[model samples]
Target: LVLRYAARSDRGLVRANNEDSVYAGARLLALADGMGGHAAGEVASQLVIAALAHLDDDEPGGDLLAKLDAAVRAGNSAIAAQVEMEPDLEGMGTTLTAILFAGNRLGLVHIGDSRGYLLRDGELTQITKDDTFVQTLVDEGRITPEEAHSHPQRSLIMRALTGHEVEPTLTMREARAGDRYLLCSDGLSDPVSDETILEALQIPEVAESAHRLIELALRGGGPDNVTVVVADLEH
Candidate 1:
């Protein structure tokens, strides 16, 4: 499908820092949310983007998952090496959610709690699972999506792009005309409601749609760094 896209990030009201990063390429779009003390979190997240962005090539026939995995490994290595030089960055890590397009197929790589969502035919669905403690409770039927949102352990990431972080979830999807894709960090999802997001995505104007989405988050109580990447399919 033919497409148009836009992305933006904001330093929310409560946080003194913005730990979100986003980048897009011809065949890929990715987002990361960094977590660490000092500035190490930002370093880890940006390194992931830099690693994947370096994989840019004229040809696109390679397995997207393998490429994504390798890119992540390279990111981890870089971060590890950085920590080796700066011991204060030892606990830095970040959540990564990336999607690569090849023809009409999409390959997804997810680690931590940043998300990927698919909106088609007026319905929206979250395509990536959160690697957070509350998400695990939701998965096991111990809590609802609403309850998990405010849970004490909500920000705890079960997996990340750091050494010993295991089991990165990879999946594939089929792209379709009239589809809308959103890749976002917790900043966007945390304070924003799904209903509000649906309304924003349904707006007629492209720029207006993205703007209103961010606005809604801020109005609701922007507590963290918010990042949004929106893709609209047009054929």
Candidate 2:
């Protein structure tokens, strides 16, 4: 498959520092939203990105999913090692959502609240589920989508790369020529409505669409660090 992509990360209007990190390329699209203090969040996110970069290396007949899985584990171990060396970074962690493209199919691995969206035939569908308390409540029919959106604990993610041995949700899907994929941090997902995001994704250029989406999040009161990565596929 042929692909065009772009990525952007911003500190947003409220966050003093951007703890989000991103990677966009021909075969890999990844985003990490970090949590913690004392710049440890930033350190955690960068560690993930750096750990995964080796996947870009040319490996004959490499197993994409296996490599991704190993990379994430290594990332977690790296964070744990850092925290061990620096006790102050004990609570540092990050949400990781990565997409790997090969042939006409894509592999997705997600943990925590960062999200992945697919736009096909002028429609947008969220491919990854949020691992948050509010999401569980919504799934169990105890709360409505509207309520979950506004819940004070909506940001409380239950899973993440915290060096604690977590199982990441994984899936694989066939892609089409006109498909567009979006991966972003909660900063964009939390404030921007899906309808508004769809409108922004309709922009002709992939890079422009990503920028427009970030603009929408900012307009909706960017309360956290916002990061966006957009990819469009064509034959």
Question: Which structure among the candidates has the greatest TM-score?
Answer: 2
lDDT of 2 by residue, 1-235 (tens): 7679999999999988999999887778899999899778999999988888776554314576777888889999999999989988999999999988886877788998999999999889999999999999998999998898789999888889997877788787888899999999999988988998999999999889999988988998999999999999988
TM-score, model 1 to reference:
0.92
Per-residue alpha-carbon lDDT of candidate 1 for residues 1-235, written as tens digits (9 for 90 to 100):
5557778788888887877888876667889999888767789899888988865553446687787788878887888888888888888888889888776777888888888999999899999988889988988999998888689888777888775545678887888878888898988787787888888888876667777777888987987888888887776
Give the lowest summed-lDDT range of ten residues in model 1: 54-63
Clashing pairs in 1: none
TM-score on alpha carbons, each prediction: 0.92, 0.96
Sum up the clashes in candidate 2: 0
Model 2 residue 227 lDDT score: 97
Cand. 1 Cα-lDDT: 0.82
